[PDB]
């Protein structure tokens, strides 16, 4: 029995589907804060804070776009991570941030502040380019451009999942419970126990699919995460100390970050917001097919415009609420499709469940206190799924010798751009300092980003290549 | 004017298209000897030898599968009777990485714990012995199983495996582009990185070289004439190598020091010698069988022929039979397993000619190129960076092609899930160095432990893992 958008359902059902959505998107909302924090800072205080903050903010802005007028689940984007890797690396290299003992980086919140200032800046850049360009964008970024970019995003990100899976990127410290690899500067090291953990998560997800009932759908990642986490607690991999030490409350601004602060990663941020625009379009349309609605009507394109507008608006809002850019989650469309319900009430239930979970900031702490390995397996599955979906996007464009060539050059040159650390030999080979050099550093940022390069090559070839 | 299989075409035309084919498959034939050799030994004698030897033997066994006049007497025949270009497979590299790694680790081969690995020809002899052994494992399983194999290795299983083969192999391409996997030595011309044990290090110049090769390929397509097709790779390689010579990246000393002759057994390798990588070899030949099937069918559609006829499947049977037969033949000739080259189907389609005379001219051109063993050395004398850009393009194309294979199956949540797990776990299996914690955690030595090492070999292999996960999931997962 398929449920339309606007109809009251048994409120128990609405709550339950709200829960399934909440759990489904949980991994996707939770993981990027963990990734950004670990790659910049240590304090568990701030991690618990940003997980709970994320939960609350995401609940709120999902509520904002659920009223688009169809189940429009919103959550933190994964593109901003791939940008921030290169960003932070340069901030620690030629930037202002500081280093210790050859490897260990000092937490540098001014970087995050720059990130939020810049992203808040360029969210506007996107909302103002959100107005009336629907099919045009579809033409400018076809699946032959779209697919490779996304594939390489998931690929370049999968490394961190595998690293945590290993037990990294920084192996456990002194006096901390259950060290099985203790060392400064081992990014991909870890003992067999860690492998077994992440693998048990992965296998847990797989079995979760094999014996998967309509509720367990899209929770398989989160359920696997949970299973591996329970086994983890059974073995003794936990820090109940920091769990106890965490506060059981969270307001949106318990902790705050620098303002009037921006970086030179402005353009990559703009690129991220474009990505989020295209993604929003695809995700919303998909929902419309899932929700048995119009797919080309004027009302449809109105839904898309509202979706993208609310997208960038909530990017600004989240930035003010100390959150990085966020976009449309695509897990839900599965849930809806298999549960036959696209009611706004499931989404709102979800939203409230999230905000509430964020308030009880012990859940956040329990999340931060999940071993790097369980997180590792779960995330590796996650990014793997991203790669696979980018590929599914690829296959929408006819595989001719032309498209195969364009994909080849874009993939290879993009990932090739990922491999290289940095460039210098031109304006900066002698370590020079001109007005350009500071934005030579910005060019370094774009160049270092893999998917940016991929997208540039794809668009360039599709432009200059002859029609087969 | 579309030219059929059997029609005399201007022998100038047949020769020229023979040349285009020769150049087309040149890179794909030449590269695996370079990769296996560099990853085992140093002597330029053996590299030049195996390059020219590869040219010769592939020409000969291409001649073996282009015709059916060799075996057909009464029953089903060998090999194919339409353009069936043959050349050394890339699966054997992906296997030989882990294989050789285990041979230098727990095997007999030696190292001196200071700089590069000692050359170990007995490893190659084991490789060849084992592969020659299992080519027979594939030919006798080459008899009458056509659509069956298609069902056992559908696109959902087929595609990921190929992708990961391409992925885990591409690393050597990038490494060479950088200037590796061992940066240039002392007194050797144009060292820009000299060091023991830097596998992916290298200066800007190396980047510039390989990148000029790659850019040369792209520009070769951009201004590409029908002859330059599938030569774009070899043309880019050539361009970047010319530029390389211009900068001064050349070793005319070893080029001069090379012999201008090459017979099939100028140099030889151990016999009665096998490793424990037998099963990985069987996997290689399964790969090559399916590969033959798909490549041939592609050719039949290119050459305007039957696609479901009995004659068609007869052609396939012959293709796989000649595949494994030429695998044994090549192995006796000190060559690794070889299978059907798929570049050609483009050329034909773009040249409207599937004449066996293009193929035979090609073959002769290759064998002749192999005899003149100064070309072989000229190939060996290409900087690792030029080689790098070119090979990188090659493997990237392998991955993408595996993906095109993938897309043949309806992208459902089921198929997406299976792809996800298969890719992730295969590549993860690639990441880990080795396992021990069970039968060998205490460094034990029982009768099993030696083939515990074989399980270690398959386990280390990325695509084998990928495929096992893929098939197991596709089996036990319910139909969506
Ligand atoms: C850049 C934008 C990336 C594109 C979005 O790509 C999206 O990745 C998500 C990751 O949550 C995949 O989602 C996958 O992981 C989630 C994790 O909760 C599972 O619940 C879900 O069953 C699985 O499909 C989607 O299949 C894909 O649509
Ligand atoms: C230096 C230059 C920088 C230039 C930067 C510009 C980058 C532009 C890249 C485009 C981004 C790709 O945007 C992509 O859009 C498609 C639809 O088109 C979304 O949608 C795709 O995947 C989702 C799964 O989650 C499906 O629901 C959908 O049917 C499919 O098309 C992708 O999830 C998103 O990743
Ligand atoms: C398992 C075996 C791997 C599958 C074979 O994969 C095959 O690889 C070759 C590389 O030679 C790709 O071919 C590619 O590189 C060759 C280089 O010789 C170019 O001439 C050609 O234009 C290009 O398509 C094919 O498109 C792909 O189908
Ligand atoms: C531990 C377990 C070990 C068991 C290992 C088993 C591995 C077997 C993997 C199957 C190998 C993949 O085999 C694959 O077959 C397809 C057809 O399906 C071939 O063909 C595919 O690509 C070629 C391009 O080159 C196209 O011409 C063709 O149309 C396409 O189908 C591929 O070139 C080959 O790579
Ligand atoms: O789980 C997720 N689903 C998504 O759609 C998405 N987009 C960015 N980041 C995301 N994470
Ligand atoms: O150039 C190549 N093309 C191929 O299809 C192939 N298969 C194995 N080895 C190969 N080399």
Numbering used by the authors:
A (entry chain B): 66 to 132, 145 to 545
B (entry chain A): 66 to 545
Question: What did the authors write?
Answer:
A thermostabilized construct of UapA with a single-residue substitution, G411V, and lacking the N-terminal 11 residues (UapA-G411VΔ1–11)17 was expressed in Saccharomyces cerevisiae as a green fluorescent protein (GFP) fusion protein. The current structure confirms many of these earlier predictions, revealing xanthine is within hydrogen-bonding distance of the side chains of Gln408 (TM 10) and Glu356 (TM 8), the main chain nitrogen of Ala407 at the N terminus of TM 10 and the carbonyl oxygen of Val153 preceding TM 3, as well as the main chain nitrogen of Phe155 of TM 3. The phenyl rings of both Phe155 and Phe406 pack onto the xanthine. The xanthine is fully accessible to the inward-facing side of the protein through this detergent-filled cavity. However, the UapA dimer structure reveals that this residue lies in close proximity to the xanthine-binding site, but of the opposite monomer.
UapA from Aspergillus nidulans is specific for the purines xanthine and uric acid but does not transport hypoxanthine or adenine.
